[PDB]
Amino acid sequence: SFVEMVDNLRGKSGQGYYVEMTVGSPPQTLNILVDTGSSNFAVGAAPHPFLHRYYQRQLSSTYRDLRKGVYVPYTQGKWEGELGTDLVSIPHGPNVTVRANIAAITESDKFFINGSNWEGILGLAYAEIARPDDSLEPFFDSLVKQTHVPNLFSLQLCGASVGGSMIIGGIDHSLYTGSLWYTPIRREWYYEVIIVRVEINGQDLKMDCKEYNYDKSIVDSGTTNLRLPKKVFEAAVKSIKAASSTEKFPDGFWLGEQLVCWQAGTTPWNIFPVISLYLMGEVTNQSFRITILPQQYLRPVQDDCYKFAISQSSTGTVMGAVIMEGFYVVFDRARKRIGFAVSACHVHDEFRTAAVEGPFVTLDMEDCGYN
Ligand SMILES: CCCN(c1cc2cc(c1)C(=O)N[C@H](CN[C@@H](C(=O)/N=C/C(C)C)[C@H](C)O)Cc1cccc(c1)CCCC2)S(C)(=O)=O
C-alpha cells in the first residue's frame, strides 16, 4: 500500500512541494504544501487572486467552529485566520479519515504565490511551535492518535516543475539505495539536528562546531535553499568562489539575486565544489556525512540558467529542499531520529556522486549544539 503513495508530490521550482488532500463533508479537494518547518494545518478559505479554489466551510456538514483566531508568520509570507475542525483525508495516502484542526485563512500577505497550484499548508513539525500555542494539536499527531498509522513519515523530493513522494506511516525500500543513516532529533519542536563538521571539496572549514548550529539547525521541506548562519555562509561562499575562480560572476549571483547562464549543455559543473555536511550519529563519538553536488545548490530557473541556492540566515541552519533533493529522508518521530539515504531519483554526474557515508568518528559532538 505504500506503492499508492509513490509520486504523490508535485510542485514548481522554488515554490514548495504539495500533496492532494480533501477536507469536509462532502470532500473538498485541495492541494496542500508539505512543510516540516511549521506545525499548523491551514487552507485558503476566502477568495484571493492567486487561489484557484478554497475551503468553503458553509458547504461542509462536519465543520465545527472553535471560535478562535490565529496567525502564523513564516520566514517568507504570513496569514491570519479562524480556527475550526473538520474531516480530512489524503487520497494518495493512507486509507483513513481523521478529524483535524484547520485554520481557515481569511487574510494573508505574500503567502500564496501567483500561479501556484497549492491553496494550503500542512505543518508536519511538533506542537511546541504551533500557533497560537502548543494546545493546538498538529495534523500528524491527530492522524496517529485516531488511527493505526505508525508515527513516522518519509519524504522523497525529486528535482526537475518538480515531483516526489510522501510515504505516510513507514519506509518504502524501493525508493532508496544503500543504507539509511540516522541523526537524532535533538528536541521536538522544529526537526532540529546537529551538524558536527563541514567540508568543501574535501577540505574542513575548520570553524568552531557551534557556528554550524548557531541558534539551531533544522530540516525544513518548506524552504527552498540551504540556509547558513552569517559566519558560516561567508566562509562557504569564499571557498566556493575560490574553487570556481576560473570564471567570474556578477556577484548579485552569490547573493541569489542574479541568474547565471551558459549555452545549453555547457554548464561547467566541475568547477563547483561538493559540500559535505557531517551529522551527529546514533552512537557515542559517531557521525555520518551527506554530500551534495552543485546540481543541487544551483537551482535551474534559451540557455541553461541557475540561481545560487545557498543563502544567509540569522536564525540558524536551514536544510531546505536543495539539501533534501536526491535523498530519501525518514522523519522517524517514534524513535526521535531523522534518516538519510541516497534516493532512487538522484542527479547524475559522470564523475561525482551525491552520497550518504559512514560511520565516522567525531569527538565531543555535544559541544556542537548551541545553548
Ligand atoms: C526568503 C526567505 C528564506 N527562503 C525561503 C523560501 C521559501 C519559503 C521559505 C523560506 C519558508 O519560510 N517556508 C515555510 C516553513 N519554514 C520556515 C517557517 O517560517 N516556519 C514557521 C514558524 C514555525 C512560525 C523556517 C522556520 O524558516 C513554509 C512556506 C511558506 C510560504 C511559502 C512556501 C513555504 C513555499 C515555498 C516558498 C519559498 S530561501 C530563499 O529558500 O532561503
GROMACS .gro file of C-alpha atoms and ligand atoms in nm:
model
  413
    1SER     CA    1   0.000   0.000   0.000
    2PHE     CA    2   0.297   0.236   0.007
    3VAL     CA    3   0.312   0.195  -0.372
    4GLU     CA    4  -0.009   0.402  -0.379
    5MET     CA    5   0.176   0.695  -0.220
    6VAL     CA    6   0.474   0.687  -0.455
    7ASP     CA    7   0.484   1.001  -0.673
    8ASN     CA    8   0.208   1.174  -0.477
    9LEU     CA    9   0.402   1.502  -0.464
   10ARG     CA   10   0.415   1.780  -0.724
   11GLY     CA   11   0.531   2.141  -0.736
   12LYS     CA   12   0.709   2.429  -0.908
   13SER     CA   13   1.077   2.505  -0.851
   14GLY     CA   14   1.126   2.743  -0.559
   15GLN     CA   15   0.758   2.724  -0.463
   16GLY     CA   16   0.748   2.412  -0.244
   17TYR     CA   17   0.605   2.061  -0.280
   18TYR     CA   18   0.235   1.981  -0.237
   19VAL     CA   19   0.015   1.678  -0.178
   20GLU     CA   20  -0.354   1.639  -0.262
   21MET     CA   21  -0.594   1.635   0.033
   22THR     CA   22  -0.970   1.659   0.091
   23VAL     CA   23  -1.146   1.841   0.375
   24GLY     CA   24  -1.508   1.844   0.491
   25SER     CA   25  -1.829   1.659   0.403
   26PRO     CA   26  -1.876   1.623   0.112
   27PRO     CA   27  -1.495   1.610   0.047
   28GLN     CA   28  -1.345   1.933  -0.090
   29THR     CA   29  -1.025   1.871  -0.288
   30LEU     CA   30  -0.725   2.096  -0.220
   31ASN     CA   31  -0.353   2.089  -0.293
   32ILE     CA   32  -0.158   2.125   0.030
   33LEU     CA   33   0.203   2.231   0.081
   34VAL     CA   34   0.419   1.978   0.270
   35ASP     CA   35   0.610   2.172   0.534
   36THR     CA   36   0.833   2.017   0.801
   37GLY     CA   37   0.925   2.370   0.913
   38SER     CA   38   0.591   2.450   1.076
   39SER     CA   39   0.310   2.280   1.264
   40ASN     CA   40  -0.016   2.444   1.155
   41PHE     CA   41  -0.263   2.298   0.905
   42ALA     CA   42  -0.417   2.589   0.714
   43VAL     CA   43  -0.614   2.641   0.394
   44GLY     CA   44  -0.738   2.935   0.192
   45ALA     CA   45  -1.100   2.984   0.294
   46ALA     CA   46  -1.180   3.305   0.109
   47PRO     CA   47  -1.133   3.447  -0.244
   48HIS     CA   48  -0.783   3.553  -0.349
   49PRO     CA   49  -0.642   3.638  -0.695
   50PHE     CA   50  -0.378   3.362  -0.658
   51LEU     CA   51  -0.621   3.095  -0.536
   52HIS     CA   52  -0.785   2.865  -0.791
   53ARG     CA   53  -1.019   2.732  -0.523
   54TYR     CA   54  -1.069   2.749  -0.145
   55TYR     CA   55  -1.219   2.585   0.162
   56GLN     CA   56  -1.591   2.659   0.189
   57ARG     CA   57  -1.692   2.589   0.548
   58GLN     CA   58  -2.064   2.652   0.489
   59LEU     CA   59  -2.075   2.364   0.239
   60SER     CA   60  -1.930   2.118   0.491
   61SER     CA   61  -2.176   1.943   0.722
   62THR     CA   62  -1.899   1.819   0.952
   63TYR     CA   63  -1.734   2.160   1.006
   64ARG     CA   64  -1.705   2.284   1.365
   65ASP     CA   65  -1.618   2.640   1.469
   66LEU     CA   66  -1.362   2.671   1.750
   67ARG     CA   67  -1.433   3.046   1.777
   68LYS     CA   68  -1.064   3.141   1.800
   69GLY     CA   69  -0.840   3.348   1.576
   70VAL     CA   70  -0.491   3.251   1.466
   71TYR     CA   71  -0.199   3.398   1.272
   72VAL     CA   72   0.126   3.236   1.156
   73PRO     CA   73   0.432   3.431   1.042
   74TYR     CA   74   0.680   3.244   0.819
   75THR     CA   75   1.029   3.340   0.705
   76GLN     CA   76   0.852   3.405   0.374
   77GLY     CA   77   0.488   3.515   0.395
   78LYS     CA   78   0.221   3.516   0.666
   79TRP     CA   79  -0.155   3.466   0.712
   80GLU     CA   80  -0.429   3.503   0.971
   81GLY     CA   81  -0.748   3.303   1.006
   82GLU     CA   82  -1.020   3.134   1.206
   83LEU     CA   83  -0.970   2.801   1.385
   84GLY     CA   84  -1.209   2.510   1.341
   85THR     CA   85  -1.215   2.133   1.292
   86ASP     CA   86  -1.335   1.913   1.006
   87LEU     CA   87  -1.283   1.571   0.847
   88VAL     CA   88  -0.960   1.528   0.650
   89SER     CA   89  -0.836   1.260   0.409
   90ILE     CA   90  -0.539   1.204   0.178
   91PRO     CA   91  -0.646   1.033  -0.150
   92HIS     CA   92  -0.294   0.912  -0.231
   93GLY     CA   93  -0.205   0.842   0.131
   94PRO     CA   94  -0.334   0.604   0.399
   95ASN     CA   95  -0.697   0.496   0.361
   96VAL     CA   96  -0.822   0.675   0.673
   97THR     CA   97  -1.028   0.980   0.766
   98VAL     CA   98  -0.950   1.192   1.070
   99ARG     CA   99  -1.095   1.499   1.239
  100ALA     CA  100  -0.823   1.762   1.249
  101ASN     CA  101  -0.762   2.123   1.346
  102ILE     CA  102  -0.793   2.352   1.043
  103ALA     CA  103  -0.702   2.719   1.016
  104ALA     CA  104  -0.936   2.888   0.768
  105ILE     CA  105  -0.719   3.156   0.607
  106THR     CA  106  -0.917   3.479   0.574
  107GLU     CA  107  -0.626   3.716   0.528
  108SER     CA  108  -0.266   3.677   0.407
  109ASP     CA  109   0.044   3.871   0.300
  110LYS     CA  110   0.290   3.737   0.039
  111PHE     CA  111   0.197   3.381   0.138
  112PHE     CA  112   0.003   3.244  -0.160
  113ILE     CA  113   0.209   3.251  -0.480
  114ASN     CA  114   0.096   3.370  -0.824
  115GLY     CA  115   0.011   3.077  -1.049
  116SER     CA  116   0.075   2.834  -0.769
  117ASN     CA  117  -0.122   2.512  -0.776
  118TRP     CA  118  -0.148   2.482  -0.398
  119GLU     CA  119  -0.402   2.652  -0.174
  120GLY     CA  120  -0.295   2.541   0.174
  121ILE     CA  121  -0.014   2.424   0.400
  122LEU     CA  122   0.045   2.111   0.608
  123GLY     CA  123   0.274   2.178   0.903
  124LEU     CA  124   0.435   1.848   0.997
  125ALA     CA  125   0.655   1.961   1.288
  126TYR     CA  126   0.563   1.939   1.660
  127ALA     CA  127   0.313   2.112   1.885
  128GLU     CA  128   0.571   2.333   2.061
  129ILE     CA  129   0.587   2.561   1.759
  130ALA     CA  130   0.219   2.557   1.666
  131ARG     CA  131   0.019   2.882   1.675
  132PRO     CA  132  -0.146   3.017   1.883
  133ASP     CA  133   0.020   2.772   2.126
  134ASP     CA  134   0.107   2.405   2.180
  135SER     CA  135  -0.251   2.311   2.274
  136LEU     CA  136  -0.350   2.318   1.908
  137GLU     CA  137  -0.281   1.956   1.808
  138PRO     CA  138  -0.094   1.928   1.473
  139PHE     CA  139  -0.240   1.716   1.193
  140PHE     CA  140   0.009   1.428   1.212
  141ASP     CA  141  -0.044   1.397   1.586
  142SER     CA  142  -0.419   1.375   1.518
  143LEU     CA  143  -0.356   1.120   1.242
  144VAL     CA  144  -0.151   0.891   1.465
  145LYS     CA  145  -0.385   0.920   1.765
  146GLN     CA  146  -0.707   0.845   1.576
  147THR     CA  147  -0.570   0.568   1.353
  148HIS     CA  148  -0.314   0.286   1.348
  149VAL     CA  149  -0.079   0.472   1.114
  150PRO     CA  150   0.275   0.434   1.258
  151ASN     CA  151   0.435   0.752   1.394
  152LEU     CA  152   0.672   0.802   1.103
  153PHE     CA  153   0.677   0.954   0.754
  154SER     CA  154   0.927   0.978   0.467
  155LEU     CA  155   0.991   1.244   0.204
  156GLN     CA  156   1.148   1.177  -0.133
  157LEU     CA  157   1.192   1.512  -0.306
  158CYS     CA  158   1.300   1.489  -0.669
  159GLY     CA  159   1.447   1.776  -0.868
  160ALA     CA  160   1.348   1.893  -1.216
  161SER     CA  161   0.823   2.170  -1.227
  162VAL     CA  162   0.917   1.903  -0.973
  163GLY     CA  163   0.788   1.578  -0.823
  164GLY     CA  164   0.832   1.336  -0.535
  165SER     CA  165   0.686   1.106  -0.270
  166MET     CA  166   0.548   1.141   0.082
  167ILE     CA  167   0.526   0.796   0.238
  168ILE     CA  168   0.290   0.819   0.535
  169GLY     CA  169   0.333   0.564   0.810
  170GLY     CA  170   0.652   0.396   0.700
  171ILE     CA  171   0.954   0.341   0.481
  172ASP     CA  172   0.937   0.237   0.114
  173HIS     CA  173   1.254   0.042   0.049
  174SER     CA  174   1.222   0.062  -0.330
  175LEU     CA  175   1.274   0.440  -0.314
  176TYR     CA  176   1.635   0.443  -0.195
  177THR     CA  177   1.965   0.258  -0.227
  178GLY     CA  178   2.233   0.167   0.027
  179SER     CA  179   2.185   0.210   0.400
  180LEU     CA  180   1.986   0.465   0.596
  181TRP     CA  181   2.192   0.681   0.829
  182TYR     CA  182   2.017   0.837   1.129
  183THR     CA  183   2.077   1.159   1.321
  184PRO     CA  184   1.891   1.233   1.648
  185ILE     CA  185   1.611   1.481   1.661
  186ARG     CA  186   1.766   1.697   1.928
  187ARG     CA  187   1.439   1.840   2.062
  188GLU     CA  188   1.083   1.803   1.939
  189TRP     CA  189   0.990   2.144   1.809
  190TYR     CA  190   1.131   2.206   1.469
  191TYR     CA  191   1.303   1.895   1.340
  192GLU     CA  192   1.630   2.011   1.499
  193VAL     CA  193   1.955   1.830   1.427
  194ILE     CA  194   2.324   1.881   1.500
  195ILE     CA  195   2.590   1.944   1.236
  196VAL     CA  196   2.936   1.845   1.362
  197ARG     CA  197   3.160   1.905   1.059
  198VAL     CA  198   3.157   2.079   0.722
  199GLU     CA  199   3.387   2.001   0.428
  200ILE     CA  200   3.410   2.167   0.085
  201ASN     CA  201   3.587   1.956  -0.180
  202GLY     CA  202   3.745   1.751   0.098
  203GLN     CA  203   3.875   2.048   0.297
  204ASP     CA  204   3.750   2.113   0.650
  205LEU     CA  205   3.603   2.461   0.705
  206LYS     CA  206   3.769   2.433   1.048
  207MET     CA  207   3.517   2.656   1.220
  208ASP     CA  208   3.406   2.608   1.580
  209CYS     CA  209   3.137   2.338   1.564
  210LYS     CA  210   2.888   2.566   1.739
  211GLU     CA  211   2.893   2.808   1.448
  212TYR     CA  212   2.727   2.544   1.229
  213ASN     CA  213   2.430   2.531   1.465
  214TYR     CA  214   2.439   2.892   1.583
  215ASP     CA  215   2.091   2.930   1.723
  216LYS     CA  216   1.983   2.599   1.568
  217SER     CA  217   1.984   2.364   1.269
  218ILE     CA  218   1.653   2.238   1.131
  219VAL     CA  219   1.528   2.021   0.844
  220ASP     CA  220   1.270   2.225   0.652
  221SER     CA  221   1.097   2.095   0.338
  222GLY     CA  222   0.914   2.429   0.316
  223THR     CA  223   1.237   2.620   0.250
  224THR     CA  224   1.394   2.619  -0.098
  225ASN     CA  225   1.756   2.683  -0.004
  226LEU     CA  226   2.037   2.560   0.211
  227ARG     CA  227   2.046   2.848   0.458
  228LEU     CA  228   2.356   2.912   0.669
  229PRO     CA  229   2.431   3.142   0.963
  230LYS     CA  230   2.621   3.456   0.860
  231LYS     CA  231   2.968   3.347   0.965
  232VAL     CA  232   2.932   3.000   0.809
  233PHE     CA  233   2.774   3.137   0.490
  234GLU     CA  234   3.062   3.379   0.432
  235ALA     CA  235   3.324   3.108   0.483
  236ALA     CA  236   3.137   2.875   0.246
  237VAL     CA  237   3.097   3.136  -0.028
  238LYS     CA  238   3.464   3.235  -0.007
  239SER     CA  239   3.557   2.870  -0.056
  240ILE     CA  240   3.311   2.814  -0.342
  241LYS     CA  241   3.435   3.133  -0.510
  242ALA     CA  242   3.793   3.008  -0.484
  243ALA     CA  243   3.706   2.673  -0.642
  244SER     CA  244   3.523   2.836  -0.934
  245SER     CA  245   3.763   3.130  -0.974
  246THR     CA  246   3.822   3.019  -1.335
  247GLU     CA  247   3.503   3.218  -1.406
  248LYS     CA  248   3.388   3.548  -1.262
  249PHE     CA  249   3.035   3.609  -1.159
  250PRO     CA  250   2.807   3.906  -1.134
  251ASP     CA  251   2.809   3.894  -0.752
  252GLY     CA  252   2.440   3.950  -0.743
  253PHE     CA  253   2.457   3.582  -0.811
  254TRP     CA  254   2.631   3.500  -0.484
  255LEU     CA  255   2.353   3.686  -0.303
  256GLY     CA  256   2.096   3.489  -0.500
  257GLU     CA  257   1.972   3.799  -0.680
  258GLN     CA  258   2.108   3.738  -1.029
  259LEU     CA  259   2.084   3.443  -1.266
  260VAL     CA  260   2.385   3.289  -1.436
  261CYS     CA  261   2.364   3.132  -1.779
  262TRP     CA  262   2.571   2.912  -2.007
  263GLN     CA  263   2.496   2.773  -2.353
  264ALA     CA  264   2.267   2.470  -2.327
  265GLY     CA  265   2.462   2.164  -2.213
  266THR     CA  266   2.783   2.352  -2.134
  267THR     CA  267   2.738   2.423  -1.761
  268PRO     CA  268   3.083   2.382  -1.603
  269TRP     CA  269   2.977   2.159  -1.313
  270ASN     CA  270   3.337   2.053  -1.248
  271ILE     CA  271   3.444   2.399  -1.128
  272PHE     CA  272   3.186   2.397  -0.848
  273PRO     CA  273   3.283   2.200  -0.533
  274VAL     CA  274   3.097   1.927  -0.349
  275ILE     CA  275   2.975   2.009   0.003
  276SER     CA  276   2.977   1.757   0.287
  277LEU     CA  277   2.766   1.803   0.599
  278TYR     CA  278   2.854   1.572   0.889
  279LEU     CA  279   2.561   1.494   1.119
  280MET     CA  280   2.563   1.356   1.474
  281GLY     CA  281   2.509   0.980   1.465
  282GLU     CA  282   2.320   0.730   1.683
  283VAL     CA  283   2.616   0.603   1.890
  284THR     CA  284   2.882   0.772   2.103
  285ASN     CA  285   3.157   0.955   1.910
  286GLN     CA  286   2.994   0.858   1.579
  287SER     CA  287   2.877   1.070   1.288
  288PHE     CA  288   2.799   1.031   0.916
  289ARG     CA  289   2.817   1.261   0.615
  290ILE     CA  290   2.587   1.364   0.336
  291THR     CA  291   2.749   1.504   0.023
  292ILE     CA  292   2.567   1.735  -0.217
  293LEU     CA  293   2.663   1.828  -0.573
  294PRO     CA  294   2.644   2.169  -0.745
  295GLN     CA  295   2.348   2.024  -0.935
  296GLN     CA  296   2.166   2.058  -0.604
  297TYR     CA  297   2.269   2.407  -0.486
  298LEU     CA  298   2.246   2.561  -0.833
  299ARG     CA  299   1.871   2.573  -0.890
  300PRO     CA  300   1.753   2.579  -1.254
  301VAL     CA  301   1.542   2.884  -1.343
  302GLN     CA  302   1.730   2.965  -2.434
  303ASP     CA  303   2.038   2.888  -2.223
  304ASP     CA  304   2.075   2.683  -1.907
  305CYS     CA  305   2.029   2.932  -1.624
  306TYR     CA  306   2.070   2.898  -1.249
  307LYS     CA  307   2.027   3.079  -0.919
  308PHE     CA  308   2.266   3.024  -0.627
  309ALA     CA  309   2.050   2.833  -0.375
  310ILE     CA  310   2.277   2.877  -0.075
  311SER     CA  311   2.178   3.182   0.126
  312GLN     CA  312   2.237   3.359   0.457
  313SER     CA  313   2.035   3.319   0.777
  314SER     CA  314   2.015   3.491   1.115
  315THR     CA  315   1.811   3.212   1.273
  316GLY     CA  316   2.043   2.914   1.226
  317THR     CA  317   2.099   2.649   0.959
  318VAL     CA  318   1.804   2.553   0.744
  319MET     CA  319   1.841   2.231   0.546
  320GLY     CA  320   1.585   2.301   0.273
  321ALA     CA  321   1.470   2.136  -0.050
  322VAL     CA  322   1.807   2.165  -0.227
  323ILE     CA  323   1.956   1.953   0.052
  324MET     CA  324   1.665   1.707   0.070
  325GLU     CA  325   1.651   1.656  -0.310
  326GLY     CA  326   1.847   1.349  -0.415
  327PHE     CA  327   1.799   1.190  -0.072
  328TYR     CA  328   1.534   0.974   0.094
  329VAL     CA  329   1.459   1.142   0.426
  330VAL     CA  330   1.286   0.949   0.705
  331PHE     CA  331   1.121   1.152   0.982
  332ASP     CA  332   1.114   0.875   1.244
  333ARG     CA  333   0.915   1.051   1.517
  334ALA     CA  334   0.863   0.727   1.709
  335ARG     CA  335   1.239   0.685   1.762
  336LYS     CA  336   1.326   1.057   1.767
  337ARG     CA  337   1.560   1.043   1.469
  338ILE     CA  338   1.591   1.150   1.106
  339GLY     CA  339   1.728   0.910   0.846
  340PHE     CA  340   1.912   0.990   0.523
  341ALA     CA  341   1.983   0.765   0.223
  342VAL     CA  342   2.067   0.808  -0.144
  343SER     CA  343   1.736   0.850  -0.331
  344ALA     CA  344   1.621   0.650  -0.634
  345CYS     CA  345   1.592   0.987  -0.800
  346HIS     CA  346   1.937   1.126  -0.777
  347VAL     CA  347   2.101   1.369  -1.006
  348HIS     CA  348   2.358   1.203  -1.228
  349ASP     CA  349   2.702   1.337  -1.273
  350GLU     CA  350   2.956   1.148  -1.477
  351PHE     CA  351   3.246   1.199  -1.239
  352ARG     CA  352   3.097   1.270  -0.896
  353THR     CA  353   2.810   1.136  -0.685
  354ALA     CA  354   2.585   1.254  -0.404
  355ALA     CA  355   2.638   1.022  -0.108
  356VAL     CA  356   2.545   0.926   0.248
  357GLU     CA  357   2.853   0.770   0.409
  358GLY     CA  358   2.953   0.635   0.749
  359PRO     CA  359   3.048   0.564   1.009
  360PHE     CA  360   3.288   0.845   1.104
  361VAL     CA  361   3.447   0.913   1.441
  362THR     CA  362   3.390   1.262   1.578
  363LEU     CA  363   3.487   1.352   1.933
  364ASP     CA  364   3.300   1.596   2.162
  365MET     CA  365   2.991   1.626   1.939
  366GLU     CA  366   2.778   1.761   2.227
  367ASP     CA  367   2.984   2.081   2.224
  368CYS     CA  368   2.845   2.148   1.875
  369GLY     CA  369   2.492   2.212   1.997
  370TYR     CA  370   2.409   2.576   2.064
  371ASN     CA  371   2.287   2.664   2.411
  372LIG     C1  372   1.308   3.415   0.153
  372LIG     C2  373   1.322   3.354   0.292
  372LIG     C3  374   1.412   3.227   0.303
  372LIG     N1  375   1.388   3.120   0.197
  372LIG     C4  376   1.256   3.062   0.190
  372LIG     C5  377   1.193   3.041   0.066
  372LIG     C6  378   1.064   2.986   0.053
  372LIG     C7  379   0.995   2.951   0.171
  372LIG     C8  380   1.056   2.970   0.297
  372LIG     C9  381   1.183   3.026   0.304
  372LIG    C10  382   0.975   2.932   0.417
  372LIG     O1  383   0.995   3.007   0.518
  372LIG     N2  384   0.883   2.832   0.431
  372LIG    C11  385   0.792   2.796   0.544
  372LIG    C12  386   0.849   2.698   0.660
  372LIG     N3  387   0.987   2.719   0.705
  372LIG    C13  388   1.015   2.833   0.795
  372LIG    C14  389   0.898   2.888   0.887
  372LIG     O2  390   0.867   3.008   0.863
  372LIG     N4  391   0.828   2.824   0.989
  372LIG    C15  392   0.716   2.890   1.068
  372LIG    C16  393   0.738   2.903   1.224
  372LIG    C17  394   0.721   2.769   1.296
  372LIG    C18  395   0.643   3.008   1.289
  372LIG    C19  396   1.151   2.820   0.871
  372LIG    C20  397   1.136   2.824   1.025
  372LIG     O3  398   1.226   2.928   0.826
  372LIG    C21  399   0.664   2.740   0.473
  372LIG    C22  400   0.624   2.817   0.344
  372LIG    C23  401   0.557   2.941   0.349
  372LIG    C24  402   0.523   3.009   0.231
  372LIG    C25  403   0.554   2.955   0.105
  372LIG    C26  404   0.620   2.832   0.094
  372LIG    C27  405   0.652   2.769   0.215
  372LIG    C28  406   0.656   2.769  -0.041
  372LIG    C29  407   0.799   2.794  -0.087
  372LIG    C30  408   0.847   2.940  -0.098
  372LIG    C31  409   0.997   2.964  -0.084
  372LIG     S1  410   1.512   3.077   0.092
  372LIG    C32  411   1.511   3.188  -0.040
  372LIG     O4  412   1.483   2.948   0.044
  372LIG     O5  413   1.638   3.092   0.156
   0.00000   0.00000   0.00000
